[PDB]
Design a protein around this nucleic acid. Structure first.
Lengths: 181, 534, 534
RNA sequence: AAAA
RNA sequence: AAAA
């Protein structure tokens, strides 16, 4: 919509063209010479500087991000099928997304165990609501997820003291879930 | 309340008689003719009554001039008195009906009358006149009734039951119902028949002979209309199966209710009900409960749809047959490649609209696709297909669907690992960093079918981790499933059946199998299929 | 040659009479009843003849026991003698036809008879019996004729024309033709009507009343069948226009030929011919010669196709209407973007199936495309569309096609440079090193239309280099075109009309305009459209 | 991992 | 460049 995405899209259009010039050997009359390319690279770098300014303030409006403690794929009772995408994140990636969700005011926590509240509050110095509710993924919604990379006995809940050791050996997993359909 | 009466004229001994209309026998009229007692009885209901007589000129002169015709002078004098309390009577001349041309002149007279009338009802009192004339006119009404629909009644004054003038509208009814029966029987048109069905219902409702709500004539007619609309307009096989199953159940109840009800002629309405019996339902794989497999491709669903293709052809609906044939072949590709769970997924369907036995299947797709495009693109850009070629191709394709469907009930599409899980999770290998998953809601029947087949193919990888879920599956489905509360990981292309609680209990709570049964009663137990596409 | 006769029984004075069948009046039989003279005349043709009488039990006893019934004993004695040279006669009992139930018992009797017969013909001698019975049976035949089709004849022994027994098969004919007329009139079905058309032709051919080859009934029926097949099966608008134009010409010749031909009942066959008059042809833009614009998209062709969409809807053919509506909107996009020359090019058509007034046009495409897919994909993957929504959408789209078609007859799609060339060459700029060209064969009418419009839009760039070609164009098309024997070069997107010799003369030869006329007579002059796409 |  |  706004002026900024138009700026970004145009700069791709042009970068694309002259990358293709490099990337197909200029065949079929699409050549670029060294000096024009070097000029274009510099012009383009100026505008990247400009774009990176405009974006460094942009309240990039993250929509609802649910917070889950399982990599489940609930869809509305409304829906009969779904397509989901899951990505493994690092503890840093997890912290970054979570922090931003909290600051943008877009986090929908469904963390149903206080021991996870304990864990998040300690390991990330972020306080997250405890809410044992169903959520359902509407198309285009996202979830941060934190799960045990182990399936214990039933009913077992780990003390935060044990979870520290779990976190020690990469036995606590962070995930991003996106519903594409 | 404005009525026109038509009758021929005769040359017999026209007696003076007692005439009463059957539907109200307390009223009688002394006249020497049928139309005259008719017209007097009708003006007896505050109606406007006029008459017209078709008099062969031979009757005009031989009879109605000879004052040496005792009864003829009788009749003419009564005619003159018919001016009475106001009744118009007048005559057109007609030929003997000797040959083709004469019967046609009689028809043109009937036409002239019909058009020129500015009233409500026309009564065809075929009583008098050379009957030879009367037989033609009865059919003549049928023709002209369906080719301005005002109102008919055809009557006959029987002398030797005295003498009541009898409704004989039924004679044109049965030819009306002949149009209805044929139009449906050859073309599946329900328009005509819905009149009779709502017709008979209102009468039994107005007279408590049969028991509506056991006839369910309202349901039967509404379902007939929708089933025709689902045939004419290519529609999901799920809707077709739904209506066909509703119509089986409705049909059985109304069949029970008929019972020679104590006026609602019974035999024709039964002749048609059997046509659906024979034309529609009796060629359909109903013992499989197609209604219960709404979400996946199955070989029985392919069978149901194959016969629906056959019926579409029987009713001159060839182009809907081609459309359905192509979608059916995508259903077969789905099944034969183990993608049956993608049934109602638009993307996969077009991805397989592009992407010995499999070779046979794919050649048949290529060719069916071609013919579908000929139809679905108006034959544009010189891709037309004509009817005879299309029906030829349709029959060959159906024959080969049978060949394939046999050779396929043998091919055990050897399902690889199907995990059985008790939650809708997407675990991937620690090797992996991302994954793309597809989740589909399953019916209890679909779930049981997938599971049953997985066990018999010996490809089930149970990771069911609660003993009560083992409990519940074994009872509710009579299938035995290992308790193995382990991690699993989806490789690309692996699939899981899932059995889950559709509610979030307190932490740690495990429901007992009795409780799972209770949840399942009010639909808090959910079945799913999960597939990793990437 | 094996025949079953059916008649009721009466209680009047059954006289001894002279009976002759009309179609052979040299033979007569002295009997007191109609079926008896009938049966004797029939065994007079080396046939197997049997009889059956429907005798109300009241007739059984009141009449045929009283030996104090002078004529009744007459009749029974003649019955006994009917054993004669071999004629079986036997009776079933019937009720009075007092009410619904009784008429139905009479029907069931008729049914029993019909099924149990193992012969060829059944003659319904409705002469005797309470006529009230006879009126019902005539219709009863219609019903049962269309619901085992063996053979009918219905006859009437008229006393007071002596006495000839008269074929009255026509009474069931006209109700037969009522099924034919309705089925076509509401549904465009030609099955029924083709019987009558071939029927009447064979009779006039067998009796030289009308002049076939001016009736062309063979052509009319064959064209009727193909036109129905082109309606039911979505077909190129070129075939639809072709058949409609052939059927106009055929219809005018057969209409002329009818002439009250000196047995081939005339009025119904005329009623139907007018239905096509009114239903089909009279709502069609025929003054434009659509047949002559077979290769390009035109606004008049869009008009013809819009009305064909309307007719498709009138005959409950909604799904063909959706298909044709989408292709029609691609035709409109083609025209409005000046790509009309791509009409029958499959690639361009799908490239525009993807790629204020234009905004209106594109929104209407989006929506029409959606509904087409609902139909052409079986509503699969939950994309179904129902009949009521579809017809609602069809009417809205037709209304907006009218809006657009008006607002478009104003929009001069401002053709840029159209070269006029006299050879099918592909010259490109010296700037350019490659080019991609599209060449399309044009009709003399298409060529003249493109040229005419180019001149009036003032966008023609003539490079016609022979004075005689200027000569020929001006005469043959009454259009004036500059002589400018220059190089031109196609830029991307430029177009040329071309007028060319379809023969390679000796070198250097220029044909004079007289010679060009001579070539054009035997089709050695070719018209083309050339477009540079790249 | 019937929502670590 | 009505097939330089």
């Amino acid at each position: 919509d706004k002026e900024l995405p138009k700026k970004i899209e145009e700069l791709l259009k042009n970068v694309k063209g002259w990358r293709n010039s490099v990337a197909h050997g200029g065949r079929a009359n699409t050549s670029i010479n060294q000096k024009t390319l070097e000029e274009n690279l510099e012009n383009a770098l100026s505008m990247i500087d400009e774009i990176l300014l405009s974006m460094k303030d942009l309240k990039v409006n993250s929509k609802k991000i649910y917070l889950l403690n399982s990599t489940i794929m609930p869809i509305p009772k409304d829906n009969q099928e779904g397509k989901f995408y899951i990505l493994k994140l690092t503890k840093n990636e997890f912290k970054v997304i979570l922090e931003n969700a909290i600051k943008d005011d877009v986090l929908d926590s469904a963390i149903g165990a206080e021991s996870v509240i304990e864990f998040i509050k300690d390991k990330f110095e972020l306080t997250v609501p405890l809410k044992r509710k169903e959520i359902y993924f509407e198309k285009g919604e996202s979830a941060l997820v934190i799960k045990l990379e182990k399936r214990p006995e039933e009913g077992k809940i780990y003390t935060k003291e044990e979870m520290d050791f779990m976190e020690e050996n990469n036995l606590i997993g962070y995930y991003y879930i996106y519903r594409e359909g | 309340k404005k009525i026109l009466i038509v009758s021929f004229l005769g040359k017999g001994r026209y007696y003076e008689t007692f005439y009463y209309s059957i539907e109200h026998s307390e009223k009688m009229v002394k006249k020497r003719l049928s139309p005259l007692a008719n017209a007097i009885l009708e003006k007896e209901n505050g109606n406007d009554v006029e008459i017209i007589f078709f008099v062969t000129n031979e009757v005009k002169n031989e009879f109605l001039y000879d004052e040496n015709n005792e009864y003829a002078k009788n009749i003419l004098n009564e005619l003159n008195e018919i001016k009475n309390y106001g009744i118009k009577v007048s005559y057109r001349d007609i030929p003997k009906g000797k040959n083709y041309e004469e019967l046609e002149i009689i028809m043109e007279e009937i036409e002239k009358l019909l058009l020129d009338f500015k009233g409500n009802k026309v009564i065809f009192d075929l009583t008098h006149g050379l009957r030879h004339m009367a037989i033609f006119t009865s059919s003549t009404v049928f023709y002209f009734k369906n080719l301005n629909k005002l109102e008919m009644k055809i009557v006959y004054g029987a002398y030797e039951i005295g003498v009541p003038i009898l409704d004989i509208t039924q004679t044109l009814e049965l030819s009306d119902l002949t149009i209805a029966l044929e139009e449906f029987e050859r073309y599946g048109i329900t328009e005509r028949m819905i009149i009779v069905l709502k017709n008979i219902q209102k009468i039994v409702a107005k007279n408590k002979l049969c028991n509506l709500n056991e006839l369910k004539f309202s349901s039967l007619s509404r379902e007939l209309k929708l089933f025709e609309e689902l045939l004419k307009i290519p529609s999901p096989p799920e809707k077709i199966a739904n209506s066909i199953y509703k119509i089986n159940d409705i049909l059985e109840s109304s069949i029970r209710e008929f019972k020679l009800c104590s006026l609602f002629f019974i035999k024709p309405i039964q002749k048609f009900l059997v046509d659906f019996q024979k034309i529609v339902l009796e060629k359909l794989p109903l013992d499989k409960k197609i209604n219960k497999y709404s979400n996946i491709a199955t070989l029985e669903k392919v069978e149901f749809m194959k016969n629906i293709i056959k019926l579409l052809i029987n009713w001159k609906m060839y182009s809907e047959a081609v459309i359905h044939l192509r979608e059916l072949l995508i259903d077969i590709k789905l099944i034969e490649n183990g993608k049956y769970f993608y049934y109602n997924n638009k993307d996969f369907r077009e991805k397989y609209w592009m992407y010995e036995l499999p070779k046979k299947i794919e050649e048949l797709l290529k060719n069916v696709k071609g013919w579908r495009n000929s139809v679905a693109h108006g034959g544009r850009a010189n891709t037309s297909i004509n009817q005879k070629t299309l029906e030829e191709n349709l029959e060959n394709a159906l024959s080969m669907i049978d060949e394939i469907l046999l050779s396929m009930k043998d091919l055990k599409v050897n399902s690889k690992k199907i995990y059985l899980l008790n939650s809708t999770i997407m675990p991937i290998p620690k090797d992996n960093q991302e994954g793309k998953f597809y989740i589909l809601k399953l019916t209890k029947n679909e779930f049981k079918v997938i599971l049953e087949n997985a066990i018999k193919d010996d490809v089930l990888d149970s990771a069911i981790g609660a003993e009560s879920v083992i409990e519940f599956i074994k009872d509710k489905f009579e299938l035995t499933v290992p308790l193995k509360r382990k991690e699993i990981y989806f490789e690309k292309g692996e699939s899981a059946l899932v059995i889950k609680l559709e509610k979030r209990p307190e932490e740690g709570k495990i429901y007992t199998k009795e409780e799972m049964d209770f949840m399942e009663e009010n639909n808090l137990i959910g079945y799913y299929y999960i597939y990793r596409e990437g």
